[PDB]
């Protein structure tokens, strides 16, 4: 309990706030990373009027703390987000994402002869070469593609 | 008697500008007043030694709409010829003995032209010979450019897709080079480039052409956008999918296309043109297929008829 | 213009009693005075993506007896469409561009109804779609009941055989339920029973039906005995042969059949009706197949013709 | 005020508020009915305490008036949902989901041989409450199934 | 000699309680203290007239872990014996002059028993003969039931899937009905139910059985859950997809099972058992397939060795 | 234990310089002083889901010259595992309870790496997985390069043919780029060129490479000539026949080669190497195929034996 309002909604006690999600990535992040599969209160602000992007998205998951590498799976989609860790109404932690070395599960190999399609295994990609533009290599078929290509489909 | 009377329509390289215009002016009349009994009593053979449904159904419907009878076979479903060791010269010397014209598709290049050495006076019209020619696809394409653009010259035509192995982009470039001031834009992955012999022929006639890597660079100026399908056997799985698979048209890219721009595709289109394109005024691939009826009717009319009153 | 003019004949559930009676009264006139040039100049496509000779030869002869041209293919003998990845929506959008009606059989259920979304104004008549519908078999069956029994109501109809998977017994029960006072007798092995959704629909209209385990229990009262073939894949070798294989009609069982009783079977009959039955007055399976000519002619007449002078 | 409730509720001025979404259907309805594909302010609350009706979800969509048909579609998922429009700061219509005539788009034919699977077709099922359940008939294969067989797949 | 020495292993019906225990006892000894040169110099024939990679490899690996040599074949659309003209009986008569034992799988029932009359004194072991019998599958299921539950009697065994046509479930009930006090729960779709013969047998012995319609109804009392694959060929697509809120197994369903409850499946398990069951402690189908090696090693050692002091 | 003891051999990328030398060192010892009862009592599975007679026979002969037993299969249009419904993962999970090692070749890439997650502690060796990897071919090429040239570094290696899609040439460059100072000459038709990735890798290590268009341009400086087969499927007949005055090898071409220059080919060699090269001293492709036995013997002995004092 503290004043919410919604232009930049307020205060959960204890939990995570992922703020400065680009715009239209918020729901991708809920879908992809199954953040929704918790049983705690989640509050989400979509197309919001603020920080300079102008519009942005925001997700608040109370009582859950996600980090170190969870924050990093966010880097491909929401690299400029901040992940605030909150205890007792105070932001005891502000993190940002960084390119990890592995992105599990979330991607799909664009190589159609890859075995990964059919089987009870998770996708896995070795990540490399920061912000001049990321190459992703499948664990299984060892073909290396441009991230924008895997990310299209 | 008209110039095409009793000719073999084997290659686009053999038809002149005047020949082209004659077929295209007849297609326009048959499309405007039907002549459903013009080829009454004529029997025509539809020999498709390699199957092609799209092309066969269209050639036979055109034969049916002028009143001819059709006998024939589709194969690679082992309908018995080729057996024992019957040469193609011998098959065509026996089929030629009772039909009035042979329409034929065959897998080897040159087969329609050889049929011509054995048919006596029965015209041979080629419906595809290996990777060489396909005149009746070029004729329907041209008819669709003329009918939608009003002309066949001073056109800005973009050819997109597999330009190296696509037998129809190679002939349409040769037919359009018969005409004036056309400008070509080729947009192809590096492995599927438009061959030198086409480019060399263009240079030698002083026709302008250029290579671009995005439809986006040229949308604005374009009149006819002829897309081709890439067959993923021509590349490998990962090559196909890699940054080279973006020769795909979506409705969003047409944003700034000229109001007269048309998208043409011989078909099957599998994914290079997305389903949402269909809703736009520019989608003309199916209307292009319907036009194959009047261009094939015109060739059968002109070839079997001395004089034609139009 | 008649109510069926330019309609898609896709499901029996879509044709009303009045629709049924209209087709059946036209079949009776075409059978009495031929109209062999009614569909002159019309071209029709006979697309059979799954082969069915019986049905194809009959649909095309009916097309030929009203004067239309036929182009088309029988497949599962790999005649090239389905290749590359040509969607059925795209095939029918190109075939629709030059034929006046599409008759089609396809293995998946629902394919004829989808063809309807892509054909514009070219009628689609369904000749079979997977285990769903087959209207033109129900129409010829009904025509054979009306013509031999004088009526379509107050009938005692026995359905014998594999009632669980037989797509034609399921539609004929739905068509006959459109009419009054019919009574059904179902005689099926336990594993091949008439499904609940049929029985539930009958109960809800107050129509009488009952299960019997022998033709002998009901021969006496029966007007139409519609036998179906059991395919032995639907059971196992020993199940098929075990006491369940006696859904076989012999001449001896007809001993006490009403003088008007008729035996009907969509065909192939392999052994459920013994060859000696053929000699009796009651055998009407082949006369039923000949009637498929007038019921399919009537549907093509009514669908392609605004007004019909009878 | 406080017996917590709201914490200064995101009172929107003009919009649609779907309330009493039965827990876990909240995210389902967003994806299925593509409610986030808009540029207007949404605020979603998941696993909200409805002390009075256990738990719930709630979507607040601004300057949007999703109605009539649109509301009825939700009946298969959240039968117990009150949509309420807002024209100028309070409730100006509070509509409940009633079962519709047909359910398009959302839903898949259980029938693996139905043609809708391989094709550019939007699914469509005819709804029928066999007072005990809702049966759904595919318009293509014309096979009829329990809504619960369809609602998994 | 040992009871099974030089005996033919054709049907589970033919082996008494004590023979089944002898096998199961040997297989536990061969699992514990291997004897790799036990059939040194024996050549077994692996005649798979019908192909099964999993059964053929389990058998040949059995042959080789006891040091035997192997000659044989598998025949999908290929390699000559039988042919049609060459009888099974002349194939066996010829092959039984070359080898010391014949393991065979054939598509028609009783092929193994026919073999027995032509093999001379060469033992033949049945690896499947149509829908009749598969003794070595039942022998490894019972070994897996014995080493996980500690006994073969007083078990609450639930059998699920196609009970009408799973050959392994007909055999397993026969066999478990030689031990005492077992309770059977049969959860099948009524189209796919236990035949009356298994059931009529079970009542003559006084064995308790019940039929349920969901695994959820017995999860709590059960020791072995024997899951069978439901066969799409003799089911309609829409029937198959409609059975309840299904009868496949997921870990959510298991939250109720006994600590010692085990899930067995002869395999393959396309979709009746989900991937999450694979990581619970109740999952035992893959250990079950490894026990195939020890059960078939036992049968071969007992058949080909007079006395085995292992 | 030895470095490779119980290790999976899936990709050349995964084995360091020293591992490659360890293999090559063992294989020279096994060639010199054979040990026929080294894997006595081991059963290896030869799962060739894709058929290659030459690779399958070289492997099984390896297995047997070390005394191992073999169970397995090859599958052109036949025998059941995988099927579609049965996952590769359940095939491996089942087969890894039966054998001590799995050699497998599969058409989709990464199948061997997928296998690794289901085989338990059973080593899997890759014999080809689509266009990804084939480590035992590279291991025998390097053994052949080491025993003919005397070292693996400071070599002038010429690579010829389809460099774009030869999987063996992509691997061989990777591997030879772990030793020092090698110079690479790549003679390919530009449609079939080295991918930029091999080339970009090679520049990060500082390795010298050049691209030439005729073997004649480097014949004089070269030590290994690695000829690859040019693949007619993704070449047009007329393209294939037009490349220069060709890039096939004839003895006339060799008159310039060093005394120690050797011609290697993974085989088959339909026509890029003529029959007269076969009798020069530079011909080494068949000795190369015999070294296949010693390289795969080494890998199996090191994987399955902890310490080998040979
Ligand atoms: N108990 C609290 C405290 C803070 N916040 C959220 O924490 C986020 C950012 O933390 P804060 O440092 O308190 O505000 P800023 O200085 O703007 O953080 P930054 O500059 O990194 O965006 C805000 O979106 C705010 O909603 C919250 O929801 N609950
Ligand atoms: N300016 C306003 C007014 C109302 N609401 C929302 O509209 C919904 C309508 O509920 P209301 O009729 O105001 O009282 P309730 O008892 O909550 O409605 P119900 O009977 O459905 O529970 C509430 O969830 C409230 O958040 C809002 O967001 N902004
Ligand atoms: Zn991959
Ligand atoms: Zn359906």
- The answer for residues whose C-beta is within 8 angstroms of residue F170's C-beta and 6 or more apart is F195, F198
End-to-end alpha-carbon separation of chain E, Å? 15
| E237 touches D: beta carbon within 8 Å | yes
Contact flag E242-D110 (C-beta cutoff 8 Å): yes
Distance in Å, CA A69 to ligand 1 centroid? 21
Residue among D4, D41, D49 whose CB faces A47 most closely: D41
Nearest CA in chain C to D123: C114
Which CATH class, in words, describes the domain spanning E1-133+292-310? Answer: alpha beta
Q: How far is CA C68 from CA C60, C63, C124, C290, in A?
A: 9, 5, 16, 19
A123 part of a folded domain? yes
DSSP helix/strand/coil, C24: helix
- How far, in Å, CA of C239 to CA of C234, rounded? 10
Q: Does the N-terminal peptide bond of residue F207 adopt cis geometry, omega within 30 degrees of 0?
A: no
> Among candidates F94, F101, F104, which has minimal Cα distance to F121?
F101
CA A9 to ligand 1: nearest atom = 26
- List the shell of residues around ion ligand 3, using CB closer than 5 Å: A 109, 111, 114, 138, 140-141
Query: What is the rounded CA–CA span in Å between residue E3 and residue B107?
Result: 68
Q: B291 CA to middle of ligand 1, Å?
A: 64
b or e along C257-291 (b: 16 or more beta carbons within 10 Å of the residue's beta carbon)? beeebbbbbbeebeebbeeebeeeebbbbeebbeb
In units of Å, what resolution does this entry have?
2.5
Q: Which residues pair with C283 in a beta bridge?
A: C263
Which parts of E12-134 fold into alpha helices (H)? 17-32, 53-65, 88-95, 111-115
Dihedral in degrees, nearest 10, Cα atoms C30, C35, C37, C38 = -60
Tell me whether strands D82-88 and D90-95 are parallel, antiparallel or unpaired.
antiparallel
Scanning C12-41 for CB atoms below 8 A from B yields 41
Task: Report cis status (omega within 30 of 0) of the bond before B20.
Answer: no
> Cα–Cα distance between B200 and B207 in angstroms, integer?
10
C-alpha angle C27-C28-C32 in degrees, rounded to nearest 5: 115
Q: Which residue of D has its CA nearest to A48?
A: D41
C205 CB neighbour count, 10 Å cutoff: 9
Whether residues B51 and C94 touch (CB distance < 8 A) is answered with no
Q: Residue C230 has what DSSP assignment?
A: P
Query: Measured at the alpha carbon of residue F279, what is the angle toward residues F274 and F280, in degrees to the nearest 5?
Result: 95
In order of E183, F23, F303, the CA distances from F3 in angstroms are 54, 10, 9
Q: Domain check: are A107 and A68 in the same one?
A: no
| Nearest-CA distance F192 → chain B (Å) | 9
Torsion, Cα B210 B214 B219 B224, to 10 degrees, reads 60
Neighbour tally for E206: CB within 10 Å? 8
Chain E residues with CB under 8 Å of C233 CB are: 233-234
Instruction: Round to whole Å and give the CA distance between F105 and F112.
Output: 8
Alpha-carbon span E94 to E87, nearest angstrom: 11
Distance CA E205, CA E184 (A): 13
- Can you say how many angstroms the Cα of residue D37 is from the centroid of all Cα atoms in its chain? 15
Q: What residues in E contact C165, CB-CB < 8 Å?
A: 236
- DSSP-derived letter for residue F195 is P
Mark whether D81 and D152 lie in a shared domain.
Answer: no
Per the document, the length of chain C is: 310
Domain stop point among A60, A78, A100: A100
Alpha-carbon span E195 to D129, nearest angstrom: 36
Query: CA of A17 to nearest chain B CA: how many angstroms apart?
Result: 35
Beta strands E124-129 and E156-160 are unpaired
Whether residue A152 sits in one domain with residue A77: no
- Least CB-CB distance to B236: which of F165, F191, F238? F165
Which method was it determined by?
A: X-ray
Rounded to the nearest 5 percent, the helix, strand and coil shares of chain E are 40, 15, 45
Tokens at E162, concatenated: 């196609």
Cα distances (angstroms) measured from residue B121 to each of B67, B104, D43, E75, F17: 21, 16, 80, 55, 74
Residue C119 is given by DSSP the state S
Peptide bond into E268 cis (omega under 30): yes
Scanning the structure block, which residue is given the tokens 């898949």?
D108
- For residues F147 and B82, what is the distance between their CA atoms, to the nearest angstrom? 53
Residues in Cβ contact with B33 at an 8 Å cutoff, skipping those fewer than 6 apart: none
Q: Which two tokens mark A113?
A: 């002869």
Do A93 and A105 have their domain in common? no
Cβ distance of D121 and C88 shorter than 8 Å:
no
Domain identity same for A53 and A108: no
CA–CA distance, F310 with F26 (Å, rounded to integer)? 8
CB contact under 8 A, F114 and A138: no
Determine which residue's CA is closest to atom 3 belonging to ligand 2.
D90
Residue B269 CB neighbour total at 10 angstroms: 24
Is residue A1 a part of any domain in this protein? Answer: no
Residue whose CA is at the smallest distance from ligand 2 atom 27: D11
From chain B, pick out residues whose CB is under 8 angstroms from the CB of A113: 237-238
DSSP string of A83-104? EEEEETTEEEEEE-----SEEE
Q: Which residues line ligand 1 (CB under 6 A)?
A: A 8, 10-12, 17, 19, 60, 82, 84, 86, 89, 91, 94
Sequence spans of domains, chain C? 1-133+292-310, 134-291
Contact in structure between A33 and A107 (CB atoms under 8 Å) = no
Contact yes or no for C173/C184 (Cβ under 8 A): yes
Distance CA C83, CA B55 (A): 14
CA of E220 to the centre of ligand 1 (A): 50
- For residue B61, what are the contacts with CB-CB under 8 A and spacing of at least 6? B293, C43, C69, C71, C98, C99
Nearest 5°: the CA angle B189, B194, B197 is 155
Domain housing D78: 8-100
CATH label of the domain that carries residue D108: 2.30.30.20
Calculate how far, in angstroms, residue D117's C-alpha sits from the geometric centre of ligand 4. 8
Do residue A81 and residue A107 come from a single domain? no
Query: How far apart are the two ends of chain F, measured CA to CA in Å?
Result: 15
- E134-291, what's its fold? Rossmann fold (3.40.50)
How far away, in angstroms, is D152 Cα from ligand 4 center?
15
Radius of gyration from C-alpha coordinates of chain D:
17
Structure tokens, C240? 């098929």
Give contacts of C93 with chain B, Cβ < 8 Å: 286
Residues of B classed as catalytic: 54-55, 84, 105, 134
Q: Which residue has the tokens 């002995």?
A: F301
Q: Which atom of ligand 2 is nearest to the CA of D60?
A: 28
Q: What is the DSSP letter of E194?
A: P
Contact B23, B302 (CB under 8 A): yes
Query: Could you say which of A77, A100, A123 is where a domain stops?
Result: A100
Neighbour tally for D146: CB within 10 Å: 17
CA separation for the pair A21, A77 (Å, rounded): 8
* Catalytic residue, candidates F17, F40, F54, F232: F54
Q: Identify each DSSP E strand in E165-291 by its residue range.
A: 183-187, 208-212, 224-227, 262-264
CA atoms within a 13 Å half-sphere pointing along the CA-CB vector of D12: 23
Q: Which DSSP letter does residue A25 get?
A: -
Catalytic machinery residues of C? 54-55, 84, 105, 134
CB of F257 closer than 8 Å to CB of F219: yes
Please list the alpha-helical segments (H only) found in chain C: 17-32, 53-64, 88-95, 111-118, 135-149, 167-176, 196-204, 237-241, 285-304
Interface touch F110/A116, C-beta < 8 Å:
yes
Q: Which ligand has an atom closest to residue D87 CA?
A: 2
- Is E279 assigned a ligand-binding role in the annotation? no
Candidates E302, E59, E262, E266; CA nearest to E146 is E262
CB distance B237 to A111 below 8 Å: yes
List phi, psi (to 5°) of E250. -130, 155
Instruction: Show Cβ contacts of residue B95 under 8 Å, excluding neighbours closer than 6 positions.
Output: B45, B47, B102
3-state secondary structure of E211: strand
- For β-strands E208-212 and E224-227, DSSP reports them as unpaired
Identify the CA nearest to E214 among candidates E141, E266, E161, E143: E161
Please report residues of D whose CB lies closer than 8 A to that of A47: 38-42
Sort strands A42-50 and A54-62 into parallel, antiparallel or unpaired. Answer: antiparallel
Judge C/F contact: 3 or more CB pairs < 8 A: no
Is F161 in the E-facing interface, judged by CB distances under 8 Å?
A: no
Residues B179, B181, B182, CA angle at the centre, nearest 5°? 75
Q: Do B64 and C73 touch (CB under 8 A)?
A: no
- Indicate which atom in ligand 2 lies nearest the CA of residue D10: 28
State how far Cα B265 lies from the chain centre. Answer: 10
Q: Which of A17, A49, A56, A63 to mutate to test the pocket of ligand 1 (most atoms within 8 A of CB)?
A: A17
Active site residue F84: yes
The answer to whether E102 and E43 are in contact (CB under 8 A) is no
Q: How buried is residue F202: exposed, middle or buried, by Cβ count under 10 Å (0-12/13-18/19+)?
A: buried
**Would you state the structure tokens that stand for residue C75, as one six-digit string?**
């497949």
Query: What is the separation of C-alpha C146 from the centre of its chain, rounded to a whole number of angstroms?
Result: 14
For helices C196-204 and C167-176, the axis angle rounded to 10 degrees is 0
Residue nearest to atom 12 of ligand 2 (CA): D91
CB F304 within 8 A of CB F100: yes
Beta bridge partners of C159: C186, C226
- Total of domains in chain A: 2
- Helix and strand numbers, DSSP H then E, in chain A: 3, 9
Chain B residues near residue A145 by CB distance under 8 angstroms: 238, 241-243
Distances (CA, A) of A100 to A85, A97, A134, B140, F293: 20, 9, 11, 55, 43
Tell me if the bond preceding F268 is cis, omega within 30° of 0: yes
Neighbour-count burial for C143-169, b at 16+ CB within 10 Å, e otherwise: bbbbbbbeebeebbbbbbbbbbbbbbb
Instruction: Report the relative pairing of strands D82-88 and D15-21 from DSSP bridges.
Output: antiparallel
**C-alpha distance from residue B249 to each of A7, B287, C92 (Å):** 39, 18, 22
Same-domain check for residues D44 and D76? yes
The length of chain A in residues reads 153
Report how far residue D99's alpha carbon sits from residue E6's, in angstroms, rounded to the nearest whole number. 72
Burial class (CB in 10 A: 0-12, 13-18, 19+), E50: buried
- Report if residue A126 sits inside a domain: yes
Residues E126, E130, E132, CA angle at the centre, nearest 5°? 70
CA E26 – CA E36 distance, rounded (Å): 15
| D-chain residue closest to A34, CA distance | D27
User: Where do the H-state alpha helices sit in D48-133?
Assistant: 69-73
Pocket of ligand 2, beta carbon within 6 A: D 9, 11-12, 17, 19, 60, 82, 84, 86, 89-91, 94
The SS3 of residue A146 is: strand
Which residue has the least CA distance to atom 11 on ligand 1?
Answer: A91
| CA proximity to C173, closest of C204, C211, C206, C201 | C201
* Same structural domain, A83 and A112: no
Q: For the beta carbon of residue D4, count every other beta carbon within 10 angstroms.
A: 9
Residue D2 lies in a domain: no
Closest partner CB to F80 (pick from E52, E287, E293)? E52
From the number of C-beta atoms within 10 Å of its C-beta (0-12, 13-18, 19+), residue B84 rates as exposed
How close D30 comes to chain A (CA, Å)?
A: 9
Dihedrals phi, psi of B177, to nearest 5 degrees = -80, -5
Which residue is closest to E287 within chain F, CA to CA?
Answer: F97
Does the annotation count F29 as an active-site position?
no
Instruction: List CB contacts (< 8 A) between E241 and chain D.
Output: 110-112, 145, 149
What letter would DSSP give residue E220?
G
Query: What are the φ/ψ torsions at residue E106 (nearest 5 degrees)?
Result: -145, 145
My answer on whether A117 and A136 are in the same domain is: yes
Q: Do domains C1-133+292-310 and C134-291 have the same CATH topology?
A: yes
Query: How far is residue F11 from each of residues C67, F171, F175, F298, measured CA to CA in Å?
Result: 68, 9, 11, 16
- SS3 sequence, chain B? CCCCCCCCECCHHHCCHHHHHHHHHHHHHHHHCCCCCCCCCCEEEEEECCCCHHHHHHHHHHHHCCCCEEEEEECCCCCCECECCCCHHHHHHHHCCCCCCEEEEECCCCHHHHHHHHCCCCCEEEEEECCCCCHHHHHHHHHHHHHHHCCCCCCEEEEECCCCCCHHHHHHHHHHCCCCCCEEEEECCHHHCCCHHHHHHHHHCCCEEEECCCHHHCHHHCCEEEECCCCHHHCCHHHHHCHHHCCCECHHHHHHCCCCCEEECCCCCCCCECCCCCCCCCECHHHHHHHHHHHHHHHHHHHHCCCCCC
**CA–CA separation, E1 vs E306, rounded Å?**
5
- Minimum Cα–Cα distance from D144: chain E residue: E238
Which CATH number characterizes residue D74's domain?
3.30.70.140
Which of D22, D71, D91 has the most ligand 2 atoms within 8 A of CB, as the residue to mutate? Answer: D91
């Amino acid at each position: 309990m503290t004043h919410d309002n919604k232009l930049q909604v307020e205060a959960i006690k204890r939990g995570t706030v992922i703020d400065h999600i680009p715009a239209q990535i918020g729901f991708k992040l809920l879908s992809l990373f199954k953040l929704t599969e918790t049983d705690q209160r989640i509050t989400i602000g979509l197309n919001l009027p603020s920080g300079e992007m102008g519009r942005k998205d925001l997700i608040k998951i109370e009582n859950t703390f996600l980090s170190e590498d969870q924050v990093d799976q966010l880097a491909l989609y929401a690299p400029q987000a901040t992940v605030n860790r909150i205890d007792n109404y105070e932001v005891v932690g502000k993190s940002r994402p960084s390119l990890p070395e592995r992105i599990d599960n979330v991607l799909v190999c664009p190589n159609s002869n890859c075995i990964s399609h059919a089987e009870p295994v998770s996708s896995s990609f070795a990540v490399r070469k920061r912000a001049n533009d990321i190459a992703l290599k499948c664990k299984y078929c060892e073909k290396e593609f441009s991230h924008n290509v895997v990310l299209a489909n | 008697a008209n110039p095409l009377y009793q000719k073999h329509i084997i290659s686009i390289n053999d038809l002149s500008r005047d020949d082209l215009n004659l077929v295209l002016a007849t297609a326009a009349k048959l499309k405007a007043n039907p002549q459903p009994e013009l080829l009454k009593h004529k029997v025509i053979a539809s020999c498709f030694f390699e199957a092609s449904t799209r092309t066969r159904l269209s050639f036979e419907t055109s034969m049916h709409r002028l009143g001819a009878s059709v006998v024939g076979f589709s194969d690679s479903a082992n309908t018995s010829l080729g057996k024992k060791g019957e040469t193609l010269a011998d098959t065509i010397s026996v089929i030629s003995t009772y039909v009035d014209a042979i329409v034929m598709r065959h897998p080897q290049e040159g087969a329609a032209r050889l049929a011509t050495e054995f048919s006596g006076n029965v015209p041979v019209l080629n419906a595809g010979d290996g990777s060489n020619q396909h005149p009746t696809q070029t004729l329907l394409d041209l008819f669709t450019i003329q009918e939608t653009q009003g002309r066949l010259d001073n056109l800005h035509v973009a050819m997109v897709g597999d330009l190296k192995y696509g037998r129809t982009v190679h002939s349409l470039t040769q037919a359009l080079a018969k005409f004036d001031g056309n400008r070509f834009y080729f947009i192809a992955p590096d492995a599927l480039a438009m061959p030198q012999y086409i480019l060399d022929m263009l240079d030698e006639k002083g026709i302008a052409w250029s290579l671009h890597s995005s439809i986006e660079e040229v949308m604005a100026e374009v009149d006819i956008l002829y897309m081709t399908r890439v067959q993923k056997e021509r590349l490998d799985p990962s090559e196909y999918a890699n940054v080279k698979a973006q020769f795909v048209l979506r409705a969003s890219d047409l944003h700034n296309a000229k109001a007269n721009m048309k998208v043409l595709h011989p078909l099957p289109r599998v994914d290079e043109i997305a389903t949402d394109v269909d809703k736009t005024p520019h989608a003309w691939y199916f209307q292009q297929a319907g036009n194959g009826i009047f261009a094939r009717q015109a060739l059968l009319a002109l070839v079997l008829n001395r004089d034609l009153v139009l």
